[PDB]
Amino acid sequence: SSLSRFRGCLAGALLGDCVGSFYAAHDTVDLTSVLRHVQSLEPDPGTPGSERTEALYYTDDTAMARALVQSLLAKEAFDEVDMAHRFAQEYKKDPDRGYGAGVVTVFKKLLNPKCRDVFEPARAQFNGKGSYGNGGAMRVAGISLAYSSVQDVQKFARLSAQLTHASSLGYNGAILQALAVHLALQGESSSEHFLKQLLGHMEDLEGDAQSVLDARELGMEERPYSSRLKKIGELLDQASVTREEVVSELGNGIAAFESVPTAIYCFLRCMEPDPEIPSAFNSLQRTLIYSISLGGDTDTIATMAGAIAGAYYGMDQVPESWQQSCEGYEETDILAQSLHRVFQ
Ligand SMILES: [Cl-]
Ligand SMILES: [Mg+2]
Ligand SMILES: [Mg+2]
């Protein structure tokens, strides 16, 4: 059921943001703590829903994902002016959700009606270089629910990201995240087939003039996302990889290149059980717990891993106790069903 996968995708993103938010300033995270945290959500047997109903507040990740999906539903298509104004109005309505330090400048400029070019604020960020943050990717899952063709997913993931993220390191992260959700919607796959399809798309995109120039300017390997997708392949082939090795090779940072590949690794790794994560947890729950246990950008790596895992496993693996702990879970489910109705 594509409907189950749409609902699972947005629920998975919400879970990642809400559950991961508690650990977003830790840096290093004890898995013992994470397991206690998710256990506090489960009521006594015979009791429906959550022990902590809507107690977990979402952050900027969900606030922007909601605005992006509401824009797609309002216009039945990507509309840069509509989406930019929805981002700016959402920030204005609640500026304290936990936004990036830099991107708030973009919203303040978009709130000025003298600003007519909605892409101009993003271009001015960080001395005209653009943001390479993961804010374009944290919110992009909705693009892959609205556009079925892989060519449209790339085009509109890039344009939606460019409203805040003018660096190719920012917007190619958003494209990679959107492609992972797009692939997850196609259903059962080996890690190898999943990775090879992503590597195929990213090799082509990262050969573009802007992608080569931006990577060169930041002193990075040519085709940096492609290089990290290869590293994911190598890490999946190793018997046992420590969290320290995952973070050393892929990162757990606010940079899109240090978080989007990490999220994809978390999804692929957690297809298999882990001795440190009880078999009581399904694959979606294991992906979120493992993501958060990497520390660093815990709300954002988990929201991206959750979007992919949600699209792949669907609504059957979304636990009622976890979902109903999350602020606005019912609104999130209505948005998912609306995207399915409008676009599928
Ligand atoms: Cl690099
Ligand atoms: Mg956040
Ligand atoms: Mg974050």
Residue numbers in the entry: 18 to 361
Paper passage:
Poly(ADP-ribose)glycohydrolase (PARG) and (ADP-ribosyl)hydrolase 3 (ARH3) are the main hydrolases of serine PAR- and MARylation, respectively, thus playing a pivotal role in signal silencing following DNA damage. ARH3 is the only known enzyme to reverse serine MARylation and is consequently responsible for the regulation of hundreds of ADP-ribosylated proteins following DNA damage. In contrast to PARG, the active site of ARH3 contains a catalytic binuclear magnesium centre. To understand the impact of the ARH3:substrate interaction on reaction efficiency, we crystallised ARH3 in complex with the chemically synthesised substrates: histone H2B peptide (aa 1–11) MARylated on Ser7 (H2BS7mar), dimeric ADP-ribose (dimer) and α-NAD+.
Therefore, we chose to crystallise the hARH3 E41A substrate complexes as this prevents substrate cleavage during crystal formation, while retaining a functionally relevant magnesium coordination. Interestingly, while we observe an open conformation in the H2BS7mar- and α-NAD+-bound structures, both the hARH3:dimer and LchARH3:meADPr complexes adopt a closed conformation. In contrast, the ADPra1:n unit of the dimer binds in a relaxed conformation within the ligand site, which prevents engagement of the scissile bond with the Mg2+ ions. Similar to the peptide substrate, the ADPra1:n-1 makes only water-mediated contacts with the protein. The axial position of MgII is occupied by a water molecule (w610) due to the E41A mutation that was introduced to allow crystallisation. However, the protein backbone adopts a closed conformation, and our models suggest an interaction between Glu41 and MgII is possible. Within our hARH3:dimer structure, crystal packing does not impact the positioning of the ADPra1:n-1 moiety. Both ADPr groups of the dimeric PAR adopt a relaxed conformation and do not engage with the MgII centre to displace Glu41. The most likely reason for this unproductive binding mode is the strained position the ADPra1:n-1 would need to adopt as well as the lack of a further coordination groups (like the serine backbone carbonyl) to stabilise the binding. Yet PAR binding fails to efficiently induce these structural in ARH3, thus providing a structural explanation for the observed low hydrolytic activity towards this substrate.
